[PDB]
Amino acid sequence: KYVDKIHIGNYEIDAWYFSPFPEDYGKQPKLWLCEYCLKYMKYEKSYRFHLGQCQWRQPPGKEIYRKSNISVHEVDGKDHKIYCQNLCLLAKLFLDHKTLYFDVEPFVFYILTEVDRQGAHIVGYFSKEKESPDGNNVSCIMILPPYQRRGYGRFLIAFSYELSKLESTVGSPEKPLSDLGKLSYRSYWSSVLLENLRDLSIKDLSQMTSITQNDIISTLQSLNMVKYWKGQHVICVTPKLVEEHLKKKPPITVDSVCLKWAPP
Ligand SMILES: *N(NC(=O)c1cc(-c2ccccc2)cc(C)c1F)S(=O)(=O)c1ccccc1
Ligand SMILES: [Cl-]
Ligand code: NA
Ligand SMILES: [Zn+2]
């Protein structure tokens, strides 16, 4: 059988996809995951015992972002291999296209948590190649179901671009995108580009945002805001055009004052 349900934190979550946990774990109907160290367990009793023993109350690695109770940890897959493998196995339950789970050393992982008196509770993550020949600033990106469509995914997208800006580079998420990921990027790109235009060339926008010119152009095309002239895309916008594609949920926001981070 496959794993079809997990318990993590105070949540029970149904699986969306196969994930290659060991077949004894895989063969269990339901796995129990420590929300802090991501150990996966077969039984309610081993889970309860672990909860009393585990000393971790947050992800490992460097806390590279903290604003109020919103935290991002940067975890090197070479330095916390087991944790990152466990994270990839969790993620694969909700990602069709992810293929990499155990060979985590080439990646850095950015773990989003929401903190309270008990600890830092995992919401989602994105992985990123330490070296990306293709200029991908996100490899895989996943928000756990109870947190989806609540602003956390937008925060991670914005975060991934704040890192690209700090690296003085453009970047794009690796394809294929999940169905929820594609909707979210398009919405993020639209909002960011429109907010800027309302407040410019395609190249200007790319330098300001670290969004690739390709993603800028495809977004503007869906907004019907580019013309084509002798082989070149060119922005074509007016206020009624801009301001009527913006006219609601206040985002979490990435406050670059609260980001502790320099390029590798
Ligand atoms: N809505 N978006 C998300 O929650 C979200 C979800 C996922 C994802 C989860 C599980 C499996 C596959 C994908 C991926 C991304 C990138 C994502 F954003 S939202 O956070 O409220 C939002 C995002 C962007 C613009 C507006 C709202
Ligand atoms: Cl569920
Ligand atoms: Na018993
Ligand atoms: Zn634990």
Side-chain angles (χ1 to χ4, degrees), residues 2-26 28-116 118-246 249-264:
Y2 291 166
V3 177
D4 63 64
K5 193 183 216 275
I6 62 167
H7 184 96
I8 183 176
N10 299 136
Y11 301 103
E12 304 230 325
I13 305 173
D14 299 325
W16 299 2
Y17 299 103
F18 171 84
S19 179
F21 292 89
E23 88 136 42
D24 28 346
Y25 296 92
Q28 313 287 322
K30 154 150 95 170
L31 290 179
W32 305 74
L33 265 69
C34 178
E35 66 175 316
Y36 299 125
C37 72
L38 298 185
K39 176 181 171 102
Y40 52 87
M41 288 153 285
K42 301 189 200 187
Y43 309 103
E44 177 163 21
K45 283 191 182 146
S46 57
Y47 176 74
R48 301 274 159 214
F49 182 73
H50 181 85
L51 275 213
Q53 295 303 107
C54 190
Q55 292 302 85
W56 292 20
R57 288 300 190 274
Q58 69 181 248
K62 175 183 176 196
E63 185 182 55
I64 66 158
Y65 185 88
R66 185 61 173 270
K67 175 152 189 183
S68 170
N69 74 322
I70 288 300
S71 176
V72 180
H73 280 76
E74 178 178 54
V75 181
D76 194 318
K78 186 175 177 174
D79 298 336
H80 303 269
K81 188 171 188 159
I82 298 287
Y83 177 93
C84 294
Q85 286 176 335
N86 286 353
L87 175 64
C88 289
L89 289 167
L90 167 62
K92 182 59 201 65
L93 291 170
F94 310 103
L95 297 171
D96 197 13
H97 296 114
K98 185 157 169 52
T99 57
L100 190 301
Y101 331 101
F102 301 107
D103 166 50
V104 297
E105 285 108 334
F107 296 87
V108 58
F109 296 83
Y110 293 93
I111 325 284
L112 172 59
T113 57
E114 180 166 276
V115 185
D116 70 3
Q118 300 164 23
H121 304 280
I122 182 163
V123 167
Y125 90 105
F126 67 93
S127 51
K128 182 177 189 183
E129 298 184 78
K130 286 150 171 188
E131 308 269 18
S132 167
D134 324 273
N136 299 119
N137 64 350
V138 165
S139 292
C140 302
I141 177 162
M142 184 283 304
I143 305 295
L144 292 172
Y147 295 107
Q148 291 172 6
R149 303 185 192 254
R150 289 175 185 200
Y152 298 98
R154 187 191 195 284
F155 175 98
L156 276 185
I157 292 164
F159 197 88
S160 76
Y161 284 108
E162 291 298 324
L163 299 180
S164 295
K165 292 180 184 160
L166 291 166
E167 298 178 312
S168 288
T169 184
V170 300
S172 182
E174 199 172 357
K175 272 54 70 163
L177 293 188
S178 53
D179 302 319
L180 188 44
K182 186 190 298 174
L183 291 173
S184 301
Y185 269 94
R186 297 203 200 311
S187 174
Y188 173 85
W189 289 331
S190 296
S191 285
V192 162
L193 299 181
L194 285 169
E195 267 164 19
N196 273 296
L197 292 167
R198 154 234 262 164
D199 283 3
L200 287 178
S201 73
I202 288 153
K203 181 169 186 184
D204 287 348
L205 291 161
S206 175
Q207 278 156 1
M208 283 153 58
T209 64
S210 279
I211 304 165
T212 63
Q213 300 186 51
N214 273 18
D215 292 335
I216 293 178
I217 290 162
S218 61
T219 300
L220 294 173
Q221 296 176 315
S222 74
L223 299 175
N224 215 348
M225 288 171 51
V226 36
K227 39 188 27 138
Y228 207 61
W229 191 249
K230 293 168 156 26
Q232 277 193 351
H233 299 277
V234 174
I235 297 199
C236 195
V237 70
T238 75
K240 32 279 281 304
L241 199 29
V242 177
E243 286 295 313
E244 306 274 314
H245 278 127
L246 290 172
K249 297 202 182 324
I252 305 175
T253 79
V254 180
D255 184 343
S256 49
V257 176
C258 298
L259 176 46
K260 260 76 177 183
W261 188 98

mmCIF file of all heavy atoms in Angstrom, residues 106-130, unseen atoms left out:
data_model
loop_
_atom_site.group_PDB
_atom_site.id
_atom_site.type_symbol
_atom_site.label_atom_id
_atom_site.label_comp_id
_atom_site.label_asym_id
_atom_site.label_seq_id
_atom_site.Cartn_x
_atom_site.Cartn_y
_atom_site.Cartn_z
ATOM 1 N N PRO A 106 22.892 18.725 -3.001
ATOM 2 C CA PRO A 106 23.025 19.885 -3.892
ATOM 3 C C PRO A 106 22.088 21.049 -3.564
ATOM 4 O O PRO A 106 22.195 22.098 -4.210
ATOM 5 C CB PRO A 106 22.694 19.288 -5.271
ATOM 6 C CG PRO A 106 22.903 17.839 -5.127
ATOM 7 C CD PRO A 106 22.507 17.512 -3.725
ATOM 8 N N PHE A 107 21.193 20.921 -2.580
ATOM 9 C CA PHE A 107 20.126 21.893 -2.366
ATOM 10 C C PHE A 107 20.260 22.631 -1.042
ATOM 11 O O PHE A 107 20.774 22.098 -0.058
ATOM 12 C CB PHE A 107 18.745 21.209 -2.412
ATOM 13 C CG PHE A 107 18.431 20.638 -3.736
ATOM 14 C CD1 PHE A 107 18.834 19.358 -4.070
ATOM 15 C CD2 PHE A 107 17.761 21.394 -4.684
ATOM 16 C CE1 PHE A 107 18.555 18.845 -5.319
ATOM 17 C CE2 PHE A 107 17.490 20.886 -5.927
ATOM 18 C CZ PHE A 107 17.886 19.618 -6.255
ATOM 19 N N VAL A 108 19.737 23.852 -1.014
ATOM 20 C CA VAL A 108 19.452 24.543 0.236
ATOM 21 C C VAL A 108 17.936 24.627 0.361
ATOM 22 O O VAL A 108 17.224 24.736 -0.648
ATOM 23 C CB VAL A 108 20.108 25.938 0.305
ATOM 24 C CG1 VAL A 108 19.643 26.804 -0.848
ATOM 25 C CG2 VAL A 108 19.768 26.609 1.626
ATOM 26 N N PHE A 109 17.440 24.522 1.594
ATOM 27 C CA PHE A 109 16.003 24.475 1.858
ATOM 28 C C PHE A 109 15.613 25.652 2.733
ATOM 29 O O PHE A 109 16.310 25.967 3.698
ATOM 30 C CB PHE A 109 15.624 23.142 2.518
ATOM 31 C CG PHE A 109 15.876 21.947 1.634
ATOM 32 C CD1 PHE A 109 17.148 21.388 1.561
ATOM 33 C CD2 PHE A 109 14.852 21.391 0.873
ATOM 34 C CE1 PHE A 109 17.396 20.309 0.760
ATOM 35 C CE2 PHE A 109 15.092 20.287 0.065
ATOM 36 C CZ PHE A 109 16.385 19.755 0.006
ATOM 37 N N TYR A 110 14.524 26.327 2.379
ATOM 38 C CA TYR A 110 14.064 27.490 3.119
ATOM 39 C C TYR A 110 12.739 27.094 3.747
ATOM 40 O O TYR A 110 11.792 26.774 3.031
ATOM 41 C CB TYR A 110 13.925 28.707 2.194
ATOM 42 C CG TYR A 110 15.284 29.139 1.698
ATOM 43 C CD1 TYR A 110 15.794 28.666 0.494
ATOM 44 C CD2 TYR A 110 16.087 29.952 2.478
ATOM 45 C CE1 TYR A 110 17.073 29.025 0.064
ATOM 46 C CE2 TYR A 110 17.367 30.316 2.052
ATOM 47 C CZ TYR A 110 17.847 29.850 0.848
ATOM 48 O OH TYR A 110 19.126 30.205 0.428
ATOM 49 N N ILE A 111 12.706 27.032 5.071
ATOM 50 C CA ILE A 111 11.567 26.489 5.797
ATOM 51 C C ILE A 111 10.836 27.643 6.436
ATOM 52 O O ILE A 111 11.417 28.374 7.246
ATOM 53 C CB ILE A 111 11.964 25.496 6.897
ATOM 54 C CG1 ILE A 111 13.206 24.633 6.518
ATOM 55 C CG2 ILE A 111 10.713 24.763 7.379
ATOM 56 C CD1 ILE A 111 12.945 23.538 5.539
ATOM 57 N N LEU A 112 9.554 27.767 6.120
ATOM 58 C CA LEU A 112 8.702 28.814 6.666
ATOM 59 C C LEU A 112 7.990 28.277 7.904
ATOM 60 O O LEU A 112 7.373 27.204 7.857
ATOM 61 C CB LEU A 112 7.665 29.262 5.612
ATOM 62 C CG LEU A 112 6.590 30.221 6.094
ATOM 63 C CD1 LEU A 112 7.267 31.454 6.623
ATOM 64 C CD2 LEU A 112 5.642 30.567 4.916
ATOM 65 N N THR A 113 8.062 29.016 9.012
ATOM 66 C CA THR A 113 7.357 28.619 10.224
ATOM 67 C C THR A 113 6.596 29.796 10.810
ATOM 68 O O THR A 113 6.964 30.965 10.639
ATOM 69 C CB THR A 113 8.311 28.090 11.327
ATOM 70 O OG1 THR A 113 9.282 29.104 11.606
ATOM 71 C CG2 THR A 113 8.998 26.798 10.890
ATOM 72 N N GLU A 114 5.546 29.450 11.532
ATOM 73 C CA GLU A 114 4.715 30.366 12.303
ATOM 74 C C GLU A 114 4.907 30.008 13.774
ATOM 75 O O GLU A 114 4.713 28.851 14.150
ATOM 76 C CB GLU A 114 3.267 30.184 11.864
ATOM 77 C CG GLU A 114 2.221 31.003 12.504
ATOM 78 C CD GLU A 114 0.942 30.918 11.687
ATOM 79 O OE1 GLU A 114 0.854 31.700 10.718
ATOM 80 O OE2 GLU A 114 0.078 30.037 11.963
ATOM 81 N N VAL A 115 5.336 30.982 14.596
ATOM 82 C CA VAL A 115 5.822 30.703 15.950
ATOM 83 C C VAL A 115 4.752 31.033 16.976
ATOM 84 O O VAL A 115 4.019 32.019 16.845
ATOM 85 C CB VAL A 115 7.112 31.494 16.252
ATOM 86 C CG1 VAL A 115 7.697 31.107 17.620
ATOM 87 C CG2 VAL A 115 8.124 31.264 15.180
ATOM 88 N N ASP A 116 4.671 30.210 18.025
ATOM 89 C CA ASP A 116 3.917 30.567 19.225
ATOM 90 C C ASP A 116 4.740 30.140 20.440
ATOM 91 O O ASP A 116 5.926 29.810 20.327
ATOM 92 C CB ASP A 116 2.496 29.976 19.211
ATOM 93 C CG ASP A 116 2.463 28.464 19.384
ATOM 94 O OD1 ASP A 116 3.520 27.834 19.572
ATOM 95 O OD2 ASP A 116 1.357 27.900 19.330
ATOM 96 N N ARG A 117 4.118 30.185 21.620
ATOM 97 C CA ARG A 117 4.836 29.871 22.857
ATOM 98 C C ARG A 117 5.449 28.472 22.841
ATOM 99 O O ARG A 117 6.442 28.222 23.538
ATOM 100 C CB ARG A 117 3.883 30.016 24.044
ATOM 101 N N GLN A 118 4.876 27.547 22.068
ATOM 102 C CA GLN A 118 5.352 26.164 22.080
ATOM 103 C C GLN A 118 6.542 25.953 21.156
ATOM 104 O O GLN A 118 7.436 25.162 21.468
ATOM 105 C CB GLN A 118 4.233 25.212 21.667
ATOM 106 C CG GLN A 118 3.021 25.236 22.546
ATOM 107 C CD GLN A 118 1.855 24.575 21.868
ATOM 108 O OE1 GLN A 118 2.036 23.749 20.952
ATOM 109 N NE2 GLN A 118 0.642 24.944 22.285
ATOM 110 N N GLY A 119 6.545 26.600 19.998
ATOM 111 C CA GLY A 119 7.643 26.440 19.071
ATOM 112 C C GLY A 119 7.299 27.062 17.734
ATOM 113 O O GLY A 119 6.313 27.778 17.593
ATOM 114 N N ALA A 120 8.136 26.748 16.752
ATOM 115 C CA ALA A 120 8.009 27.266 15.391
ATOM 116 C C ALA A 120 7.390 26.171 14.528
ATOM 117 O O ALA A 120 8.027 25.144 14.274
ATOM 118 C CB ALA A 120 9.376 27.684 14.858
ATOM 119 N N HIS A 121 6.171 26.403 14.058
ATOM 120 C CA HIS A 121 5.352 25.382 13.411
ATOM 121 C C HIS A 121 5.490 25.466 11.893
ATOM 122 O O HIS A 121 5.264 26.535 11.303
ATOM 123 C CB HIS A 121 3.898 25.555 13.835
ATOM 124 C CG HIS A 121 3.706 25.531 15.318
ATOM 125 N ND1 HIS A 121 3.655 24.358 16.044
ATOM 126 C CD2 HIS A 121 3.588 26.536 16.219
ATOM 127 C CE1 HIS A 121 3.508 24.641 17.326
ATOM 128 N NE2 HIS A 121 3.476 25.957 17.462
ATOM 129 N N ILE A 122 5.851 24.336 11.264
ATOM 130 C CA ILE A 122 6.205 24.338 9.841
ATOM 131 C C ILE A 122 4.965 24.610 8.996
ATOM 132 O O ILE A 122 3.905 24.033 9.227
ATOM 133 C CB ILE A 122 6.879 23.015 9.433
ATOM 134 C CG1 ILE A 122 7.278 23.068 7.956
ATOM 135 C CG2 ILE A 122 5.991 21.788 9.764
ATOM 136 C CD1 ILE A 122 8.331 21.969 7.544
ATOM 137 N N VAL A 123 5.102 25.500 8.013
ATOM 138 C CA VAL A 123 4.021 25.842 7.099
ATOM 139 C C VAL A 123 4.297 25.321 5.691
ATOM 140 O O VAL A 123 3.391 24.843 4.997
ATOM 141 C CB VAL A 123 3.827 27.380 7.092
ATOM 142 C CG1 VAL A 123 2.927 27.837 5.912
ATOM 143 C CG2 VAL A 123 3.289 27.855 8.466
ATOM 144 N N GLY A 124 5.543 25.423 5.255
ATOM 145 C CA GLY A 124 5.897 25.132 3.881
ATOM 146 C C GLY A 124 7.373 25.396 3.691
ATOM 147 O O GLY A 124 8.082 25.754 4.628
ATOM 148 N N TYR A 125 7.823 25.231 2.455
ATOM 149 C CA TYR A 125 9.251 25.360 2.182
ATOM 150 C C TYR A 125 9.434 25.574 0.688
ATOM 151 O O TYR A 125 8.511 25.374 -0.111
ATOM 152 C CB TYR A 125 10.009 24.103 2.646
ATOM 153 C CG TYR A 125 10.073 23.085 1.554
ATOM 154 C CD1 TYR A 125 11.250 22.867 0.832
ATOM 155 C CD2 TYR A 125 8.940 22.383 1.182
ATOM 156 C CE1 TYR A 125 11.297 21.945 -0.201
ATOM 157 C CE2 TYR A 125 8.973 21.469 0.142
ATOM 158 C CZ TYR A 125 10.157 21.249 -0.533
ATOM 159 O OH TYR A 125 10.157 20.346 -1.569
ATOM 160 N N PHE A 126 10.626 26.023 0.313
ATOM 161 C CA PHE A 126 11.073 25.834 -1.052
ATOM 162 C C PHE A 126 12.533 25.409 -1.034
ATOM 163 O O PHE A 126 13.289 25.762 -0.128
ATOM 164 C CB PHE A 126 10.857 27.069 -1.970
ATOM 165 C CG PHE A 126 11.693 28.294 -1.650
ATOM 166 C CD1 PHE A 126 12.905 28.499 -2.287
ATOM 167 C CD2 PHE A 126 11.227 29.283 -0.788
ATOM 168 C CE1 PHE A 126 13.662 29.641 -2.047
ATOM 169 C CE2 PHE A 126 12.001 30.427 -0.535
ATOM 170 C CZ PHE A 126 13.217 30.599 -1.172
ATOM 171 N N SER A 127 12.887 24.596 -2.014
ATOM 172 C CA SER A 127 14.249 24.150 -2.230
ATOM 173 C C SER A 127 14.856 24.951 -3.358
ATOM 174 O O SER A 127 14.155 25.528 -4.187
ATOM 175 C CB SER A 127 14.291 22.660 -2.554
ATOM 176 O OG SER A 127 13.385 22.341 -3.592
ATOM 177 N N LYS A 128 16.187 24.974 -3.376
ATOM 178 C CA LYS A 128 16.934 25.824 -4.288
ATOM 179 C C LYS A 128 18.292 25.182 -4.515
ATOM 180 O O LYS A 128 18.954 24.816 -3.544
ATOM 181 C CB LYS A 128 17.096 27.227 -3.701
ATOM 182 C CG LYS A 128 17.822 28.208 -4.602
ATOM 183 C CD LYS A 128 17.873 29.603 -3.980
ATOM 184 C CE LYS A 128 18.398 30.646 -4.965
ATOM 185 N NZ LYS A 128 18.491 31.974 -4.280
ATOM 186 N N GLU A 129 18.662 24.984 -5.779
ATOM 187 C CA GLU A 129 19.987 24.466 -6.106
ATOM 188 C C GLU A 129 21.056 25.447 -5.666
ATOM 189 O O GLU A 129 20.991 26.635 -5.986
ATOM 190 C CB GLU A 129 20.135 24.240 -7.611
ATOM 191 C CG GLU A 129 19.209 23.236 -8.270
ATOM 192 C CD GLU A 129 19.537 23.056 -9.741
ATOM 193 O OE1 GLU A 129 20.516 22.344 -10.049
ATOM 194 O OE2 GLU A 129 18.851 23.674 -10.596
ATOM 195 N N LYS A 130 22.066 24.941 -4.956
ATOM 196 C CA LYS A 130 23.220 25.770 -4.625
ATOM 197 C C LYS A 130 23.871 26.346 -5.876
ATOM 198 O O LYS A 130 24.386 27.468 -5.850
ATOM 199 C CB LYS A 130 24.240 24.955 -3.835
ATOM 200 C CG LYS A 130 23.850 24.699 -2.430
ATOM 201 C CD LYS A 130 24.458 23.385 -2.011
ATOM 202 C CE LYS A 130 24.284 23.171 -0.569
ATOM 203 N NZ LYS A 130 25.064 21.965 -0.162
#
